[PDB]
Design a protein around this ligand. Structure first.
Ligand code: MG
Ligand code: MG
Length: 98
RNA sequence: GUUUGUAAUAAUCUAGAGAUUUUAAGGAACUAAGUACUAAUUUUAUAAAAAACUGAAUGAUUAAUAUAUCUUACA
């Protein structure tokens, strides 16, 4: 037999051309309430696909980048260095260096 | 409280060195309790750098994409 399975995903198509429009009007109506997680669970999709059909307005996106930047300034020199190492190992991996 | 011991003044007595009384007097390094009388008392004194890796469980938020082309829209 073959060795154990580690990653065998299954693609699904649960959204229709009409439901895609509902995802667009909702995301633009209230991006705070109709988050991508809420729309993902509502239409039984992946959080990525929700982002492939529509994007939040530029105003809602800037506050997301700020929220992640404010939590980053709370890191000390020891945690900020470990975070940067984790981001470099990933880039090095895809360059064939790891 | 404890300790030392009956200060001075005054009264009386005394050859006079002294005695008696006021007198358990007057003191005191010490102990205990109480008391803010003195000192803890000058305008952001100093030091302290501060959340690793992998697996598992379980959340939040988000383009967390690519290819073709050079024009597109407005006025
Ligand atoms: Mg005694
Ligand atoms: Mg860690």
């Amino acid at each position: 037999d073959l060795p154990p399975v580690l990653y065998n995903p299954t693609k699904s198509y649960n959204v229709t051309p009409e439901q895609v429009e509902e995802i667009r009007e909702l995301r633009a109506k209230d991006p705070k309430k109709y988050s991508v997680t809420y729309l993902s669970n509502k239409y039984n999709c992946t959080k990525v696909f929700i982002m492939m059909c529509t994007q939040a307005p530029r105003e809602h996106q800037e506050q997301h980048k700020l929220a992640r930047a404010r939590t980053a300034e709370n890191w000390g020199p020891r945690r900020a260095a470990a975070k940067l190492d984790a981001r470099r190992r990933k880039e090095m991996l895809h360059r064939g260096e790891i």
